[PDB]
Every structure is written in C-alpha cells, then in structure tokens.
Amino acid sequence: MKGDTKVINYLNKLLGNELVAINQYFLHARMFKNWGLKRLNDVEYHESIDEMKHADRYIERILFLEGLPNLQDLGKLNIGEDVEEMLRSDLALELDGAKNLREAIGYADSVHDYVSRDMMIEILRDEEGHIDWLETELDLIQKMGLQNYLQAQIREEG
Amino acid sequence: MKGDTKVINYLNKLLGNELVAINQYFLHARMFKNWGLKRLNDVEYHESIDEMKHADRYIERILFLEGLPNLQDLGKLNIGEDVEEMLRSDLALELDGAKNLREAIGYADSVHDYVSRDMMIEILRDEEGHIDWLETELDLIQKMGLQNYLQAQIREEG
Amino acid sequence: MKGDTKVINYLNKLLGNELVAINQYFLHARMFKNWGLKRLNDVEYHESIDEMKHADRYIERILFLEGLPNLQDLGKLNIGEDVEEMLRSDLALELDGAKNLREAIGYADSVHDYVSRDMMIEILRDEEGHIDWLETELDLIQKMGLQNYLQAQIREEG
Amino acid sequence: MKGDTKVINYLNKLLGNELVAINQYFLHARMFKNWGLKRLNDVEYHESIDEMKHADRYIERILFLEGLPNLQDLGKLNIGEDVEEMLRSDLALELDGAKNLREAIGYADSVHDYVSRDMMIEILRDEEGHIDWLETELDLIQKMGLQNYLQAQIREEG
Amino acid sequence: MKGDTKVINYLNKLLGNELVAINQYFLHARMFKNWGLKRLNDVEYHESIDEMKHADRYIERILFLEGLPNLQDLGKLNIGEDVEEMLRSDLALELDGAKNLREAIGYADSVHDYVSRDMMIEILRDEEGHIDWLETELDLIQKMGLQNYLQAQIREEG
Amino acid sequence: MKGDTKVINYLNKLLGNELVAINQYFLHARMFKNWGLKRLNDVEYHESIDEMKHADRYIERILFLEGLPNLQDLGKLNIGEDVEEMLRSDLALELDGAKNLREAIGYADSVHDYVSRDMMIEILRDEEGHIDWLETELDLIQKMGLQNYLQAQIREEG
Amino acid sequence: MKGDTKVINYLNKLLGNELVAINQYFLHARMFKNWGLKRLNDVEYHESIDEMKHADRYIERILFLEGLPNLQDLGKLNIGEDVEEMLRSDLALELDGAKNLREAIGYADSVHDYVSRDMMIEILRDEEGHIDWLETELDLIQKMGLQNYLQAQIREEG
C-alpha cells in the first residue's frame, strides 16, 4: 500500500536512530560485562534487543508502505570511557530520538497515517521507559557514590 | 590481557564484515517476508542472527584483548531488487568475508594468538555453511526455474 | 452516554463497509472452497470473521452512544468470477473502507471522542493487515503464474 | 557348518553387488543433499542402509557356512551427472542384482540350502521394492517434468 | 565453493583409507561374532561405524568443495586369520591412515583451508582413539595370555 | 603410540604448571573461606578443579604417547598474604603458563602432533578465561575500593 | 584460634603425606587406565580423591589454628613399573603415613587438641581401609596368579 513519502522518510530517520542505539547499547553492555558489572550488562543488552525490535517494526512498516529501508547510513556513536559518561551518552541519544519521534507522530497524524502513528506511540512509550531507567541510574550514582554504585552492579538481579 | 595490535585490527575488520551482513540479511529477510516468501524470510533472518552471534564474539574478544570494538564504520550494503540478485549479493559478501577470515586466521597463528584463531575457525566453518546454503538456493533457481522456486518459498519449512 | 451525532453517522457508514466485506469475503471463501482451493477458503473465511468482529464493535459502540445501528442498508458487492478478479475486488473494497476510516478517525479526534477513535485505529490496523495480505497474494499470482499459484492453494496451511 | 562351495561363491557375488550399491546409493544421496534435494537424499541414504543390512546378512551367512567373505573386490560404479541419469544407473544395477539373486535362489534350492535360499528371497523382495521406487520416480520425472520434479524434492517427507 | 585441487585429492585419499577400514573392521567384527567373541564384535563393529561417519564427512566436504568423491578404488585389505593378527592388521592400517592425515592437515593449513583442516583434526583425534584401543588390546593379549584374553571376550560389556 | 620426545617434555612442563596452580588456587580458596570470603572460595576452588582437569588431560596424553608423567617436581608457589597479593600471584602464574602453552602449541604443529595441539588450544582457552576473571577482580578492587570489594565476597553467588 | 605449634607441624607433615599419595594414586590410576585395567583405575582414582579430601581437612584445620599450610614441599613418589610393584609402593606409603598419624594422634591428646585428634582418627580409619584394599589385592595376585588377576581388572565393577 503506497505510503506517504514524508512518513517513509521519518520512518527511515527513526530507523537510523534505532540502528545507532542498537550498537551503542550493545558495546556498552559488553564493556560493562568485561568490567564484571553483570547487572549493567544485562540491562543494556536488553535495551539493545528492545531497539532491534523497534528497528524491525520500522523496517516492516517502511516495506509495507512500499519504501526502501535505509540500513546503510549509521549516525554518530558516542561511546564514552567510564560508566557515568556512557550512561549519559545513552541518555542524550534517547532524548534526541524521542524528539524525532514526537515530530514524526505529529506529522503522521496530519496525513492520516494513524497506524504508523500508533506504532510510533508504542515505541515512544518504550523510549520513555529507557529514558527513565538511564535517569534513575545516573541519579543513583550521585546519591550512593560511584564505589557503592559499582559494587551494586557485580551480581545480576533475579 | 593486552592482545596483539594487528590481531585486534583484524578482529575489527571481521566485526565490520559481520555488521554489514547483519543488516543486509535482515533487510533481505523482511523483503522476502513482505513478498510472502515465508521460507526465505526464516532462513535469512536466521543467517542474520548467526552474524549477530559472530559480531558479539568479536566484540567480547576485542574487549578482552583490551582493544576498542569499532561499531561506528559500516561498509557498503548491496541490497538488490529481486530474489536472485539479493541472494548473489549475500554470496559475494560471504565470499569476501571468508577471504578476510583466512588472512586473519593465518596471522593469529603467526603471533600465537591461538584462541582468537580457534574462535575465527569456528566462525569460518559457520560462514562456509552460509556460503553452501546461498550456492544451493541459487542453483535451485536455475534448475527448477524462478516461478517454481518462488512457489516453493511461500510456506515455512517444519 | 449521548454521543456526537456525526460520529454515530461515521460509525454507521463504517459498519456498512464491514457488512459488505463480511458477505463478499464469505462468498469468496466458499467459492474457493468449492473449487478445492482450501488455503484461500481458510484465509478469506478468517477475513470474514474479522469483519464480523469489527461490525460487532461498531454496533456496540453506536448503541452505547445511544444511536441506531443500521444493518438494513447493504452497499454494492462486487463478486468477480476468477481468483485474481475476486482478490482485487476485496482489495478495492478494503482501500475504500480504509479511506472512510481515516476520515472518521480525524473527525472523532476533533470532537474529542477519543475512545471511538481508539477503537477505529485498532480496526484500521487490522484493515491494513487485510490490505497487505491481498496485495501479497495478487503479486504472488504474477510472480509464480496462475497455474503454480492455484496448485499452492489446494492444501490448507498448518 | 560346511556349506556348499558354489552357494558360498554365489553369496560372495551377491555380497559384491551389495557393496557396489552401498557406495553408489551413498554418493548419489550426498550429491542430492549437496544440490538441496532433501527428499532424494533421505530415500537414497535409506536404500544405502538397506544394502548394508543385505551385505551384513551375506557376510554372516558366508562365515557360518565356513567361507571367506570377499570385501576386497569392488565392481563398477556408474555414478552419472544428473538426477535422471543417476536414478537410471541405480535401476540398471538393481536389475542386474535381481538377475543374480534369481540364479542363486534356484541353485540353493537344488543343493538343499533352504536357509540361504530363504534369506535370499527376503533380500530379493527388498530389491524389488527398491526397483519399484526407482521406476516410479523415473516415471514421475517424465509425467510432471524435471523442473516440477526437482521442486518436489527440496523438502523432506514427514 | 571451488576448493583447492590438492586438498580434494588428499580428501579422496583419506576417504580411500576410510573405505578400507570400514570393510576390514566390519569383516573382523563378524569373524569375532562367528567365533562367539561378542565383546570384540561390538567394538570392531563400532569402529566400522566410526569410519563410515568419517567417510561421510569426507564425501560431503569433497562435494561442497566441488570435487568428485572417489568410492570406486579400494586399497588392500589385510584380513588375517587369528585374533592377534587381525588386531595388528587394523593397527598397521590406522597408523598409515594417521600418517596421511598428518600430511593432509599440514597441507590444508598452507593453502588456508582451515575448515577441511579442522574436520581432519577431529577425525585424527578419533583415529588416535582407535589406535589406543588396538594397542591396549594387543598388550592385554600378551599380559594375560591368549586363552584368558579369549575368555574375556565371550560376553558383551555393559 | 610413540610420541615426539620434545612434545612429551612440553606436556610434562605444562603438567608442572598445572600442579603448581592446583595447589596455589586450593590454598588461596581455603584462605578466603577461612576469612569468610565465601564467593572467592567458590571461584578459586573451581579454578583449582579446572587445573586438575587440565593435569589429568596432560597425564593421559603423556601416557598415551608412551612418556613418563612427572608429578614429582613442583615449581614455586607464591602464596601472598592479602587478597590483592594472592590474586596477582595467581595472575602472574597464569600468564607464565599461557606463555609456555603458546610455545608448546607452535611446536606440536611443527611436528604434526595435531591432537596434542588441539588439546592444548582447548586448555589455553580455559586459561584465558582464568586470566580474564583474575584481571576483572583486580580492577574491581581498585574501582570500588577494598572494603566494598571484601563486603561483596561474603555471600556466595547463586 | 591459635593452635599448638607442634600440632600444626604434625598437620603439615600429614598434609605432606597426603600430597604424595594424591599424585602417586592419580598417576597409578591413569597408568592402569592406559593399560586397559579399568577396575584398578576406578579404585586408585577413588583412593586419590580420598587423599584430596584428607588434604583439604588438614589445610582447613591448619588455617583455623592459624598456621601456614605447606603445599610447597613434596616428598618422594615411588611410581613403579608393573602392577604389583605399584601396589606395593602405595602400601609402603600408606604404612609410613599411618605411622605418622599414630604419632600425631598421641601428641594432640597430650596437648588437649581433641578435635585435631578426632579428625586424625577419622582419617586413620580411612587409611586402614586403604591399607586393607592394597593388602587384599596383593594377596589376590599371588593366589590366582598375575594373568588371571589382570584379566579380572579389564571390566569396571558395578
């Protein structure tokens, strides 16, 4: 079913955000794993799978709407070298992606693509969950201090 | 444990090959799925997961060896517009990647990184399985003709 | 709870679309069944049940909003005499119904009937699934040819 | 128990036939497997195991009768390069072996080796089953055409 | 995937070794079985199945590499007439085959056929297990004497 | 089967490394256990069992190759008096042993003892896992501080 | 709890006996295993594990009593080249160790270390079980002769 061209472009831009997050979350996860921070590996890996699910939804939607998913262009990763820096980088990325989502959702409505909109609202709800987790962890670092925060990451949560 | 620098560079190059294959296999899978070619979606999606597992092994190995995994640079995807063209593109990509693997495996041996070598031989064995599947499908297209080949893809295999 | 009058009129128009689709899908299903095209019977019958579920939702919603569901007026069926013609007819009907849905969803929003809107977005998501299935089948007919396509319909899919 | 010398010679000749069939069926099976013709691999591999069971019976019988099983001499394989050619080659081989079996069974009777005869009649019954399968497949190739025949081989039968 | 020609020749030579061992182990097994030496039948039959598995791996590998498996040429069997002689003959054969394996493994490495090499190292590991079993049995014959050794073979081991 | 003499000498040297590690890991484990550091006892004890498994493989391999395993000579233990010192000592020992392994693996290849090589590559893979664990723990001590690190050891991990 | 210094020295001497027995029993076990003497491997390996358990008890006791377990010094192994010689060597070693145990048990009593004594009496009871097994086997060799004795070792006991 031929979709609106600018909806497809938005879907590809949002797909691009997901592709960056997939990689950045996955590297961050395995860095934490390497450092023995088991709990942070489990969550960040899970965040990565979440983004893969989001990318898959975009790809299938773009294809249904008869567009060409773009998996060739990869935006900038900002990896970071310590726990706080990497968590903040994930947060900045989530925030920019949520901004793009809000723009796309408004636009899909105005051209009556209510199912692309509905999909995107579900994804944004997931993103705000990701934002909440990052914000909470970053605040915990400050509240209990880094040494205590790191000790709390060495065992996986049941 | 500080690894050999050129082994790490090879691991990053091989990781780069996997990142291209992950995306190309995943798009191809969902294109087939869109077209109703259920069987080709299932296999290509599975090939994609295989490459993700390979990428994960590289990332963890690079990190152990104290290098920086590179997930920022993404080589060229060659998507293709019809079944044969997309299968051939996956094959060309596999063949180039197997070539790089052979070079890396020889080099790891000469610097005594026998566990990076061992990991890479396991991965190459998987790649040759991927090559075999692609070659077989492409030959089946020619042998039974495209119409019959397409009809054989519409139901998933048990 | 007294609903908006024009929302009720939209709900009745959309109900009318569903009543046409229920009958056209059901006849098409049993035509396919008669012809031994088991797989097409199963899917079209299922599409028919889907439309019945949609009609039921409209009826219950209209009644809640204190309107009179209209099951008396039945729009034009376009049955068709061969597989392709009947599938295209179902597609044209789905496309017109999706158009009406988009109009109604926009209008419900402007009068703040957010639950009629929410119901209608769910239904449209189902309709786009129906559209996708029809488009895919029609493309498969062209790609594998009619004889092969027909052979692929004689056994039901597990 | 000292057997008749010419019965032992017949048993060794029949053993020789089985050794050829074991190898030819096994190669043919893996050629089909390589080509993605899963169904033909399964049946030909099974035919190969059948011949191994036949060879085992001959070996044990020759030994009981106090002869020397001959596994050293291997007659001519005729492999063939395409499906029809390889199936016909298996058929020609089965037909020659059935001929030898008929001769041996007649002879065993005339020297009162009724248990060698009984074993050989069971084996011939199996061989005629193998002949029937080959003849049927070859006729199916002609009836549905090679392209359709090949498409029908790509999935294993439950 | 077109393999190296000399690797294919090595694979065919190694296949040839396996074909000899399959037959020699299988005859030896049924000779032992005839003699009531149940335990030696079970192990030698098992060794025979092992060699069949090895031959199958070679055949599939040669075919993947686009060569022609050679099951036509059968090297010399050395059957032997008593337990010690037959066990020694199996040992001499294993030793020659291990020698050929070592040569082939070195060569596959030098042309970067690391998966043929990997397969062959697995097979050699199995062969050294076969060598160990033969050497052990032969030493047991000398240590406990032949009469005691034979008595120990008449019941199968749980 | 008579092995290469220098391979046997390497196997005995590597066995010697394992015998040192068995004892040093086992004492370290029970020191941690005494101190109430349950988690460190469990892992170090497990590392000790791993080394015992490695020693067993060497012993069995040396014996197969017809050499004399040397369990008489025991190299220097470096026990250490506090957690960090003992973990570093285990690390230094692992690193020297990995060095010896790399040398032996290269040599086994050059004399075509591919199964001793294969065994040793498996063992080295295990050793690099041991190295990774030690490095990670030592870095955790510095990152969270010793007091927090010690508190994290008092309960065993599920 | 600060133990008596001479008790700790006795515990270390007894530990030293156990470390010799662990190694000698383990090598003897794998020599028997190599020779196909399955039953002797199972028992000697088990005796080895028993000594490991004894060593562990000493180590934990020494540490509790605030001494330094000595795993660095390893007394003389006497391996032996044939079954009888190796069994006698294990026996001589057990006998010397039982002698040391008797001395230590008497001394622990005189300084009121009744729990070290109690532990040591349990260990001595185990040692006398080991002595009994060795004496019995050695007498069986003489009674049934070596050839019969060896034949009786080739299958493991249920």
Ligand code: HEM
């Ligand atoms: C590029 C770096 C990536 C890495 C390292 C990676 C890694 C992984 C791993 C380890 C898994 C678990 C395998 C399993 O399902 O059992 C997984 C699952 C999955 N991946 Fe990826 N992936 C990557 C990118 C992608 C991309 C680009 C997509 C496309 C949208 C994708 C889609 C999926 C999906 C749909 C699953 C299955 C989710 C589930 O059911 O658990 N991944 N990935």
Ligand code: HEM
């Ligand atoms: C030529 C003399 C041979 C004899 C007498 C023989 C005999 C047997 C027998 C009795 C079996 C057990 C049947 C079963 O699987 O239940 C067997 C299994 C098998 N044979 Fe043969 N065989 C011979 C040669 C070969 C050859 C040349 C190949 C080709 C590589 C081969 C491949 C196999 C395989 C793959 C199995 C199944 C293994 C398993 O899963 O148990 N055999 N053979």
Ligand code: HEM
């Ligand atoms: C010298 C100091 C040693 C100590 C204190 C020690 C201690 C232990 C203990 C407590 C166990 C657990 C018992 C069980 O299996 O339930 C064990 C297991 C074992 N040990 Fe030792 N051991 C030592 C040396 C050795 C040596 C030199 C070897 C020879 C290679 C060895 C081989 C084994 C094996 C094969 C196991 C069984 C592993 C399993 O399946 O859990 N050990 N050891």
Ligand SMILES: [Fe+2]
């Ligand atoms: Fe989630």
Ligand SMILES: [Fe+2]
């Ligand atoms: Fe796979």
Ligand SMILES: [Fe+2]
């Ligand atoms: Fe449905």
Ligand SMILES: [Fe+2]
């Ligand atoms: Fe059969």
Ligand SMILES: [Fe+2]
């Ligand atoms: Fe085996």
Ligand SMILES: [Fe+2]
């Ligand atoms: Fe481990």
Ligand SMILES: [Fe+2]
């Ligand atoms: Fe015991």
Ligand SMILES: [Zn+2]
């Ligand atoms: Zn996302």
Ligand SMILES: [Zn+2]
């Ligand atoms: Zn997110």
Ligand SMILES: [Zn+2]
């Ligand atoms: Zn890969």
Ligand SMILES: [Zn+2]
């Ligand atoms: Zn691949």
Ligand SMILES: [Zn+2]
């Ligand atoms: Zn509907």
Ligand SMILES: [Zn+2]
């Ligand atoms: Zn519909």
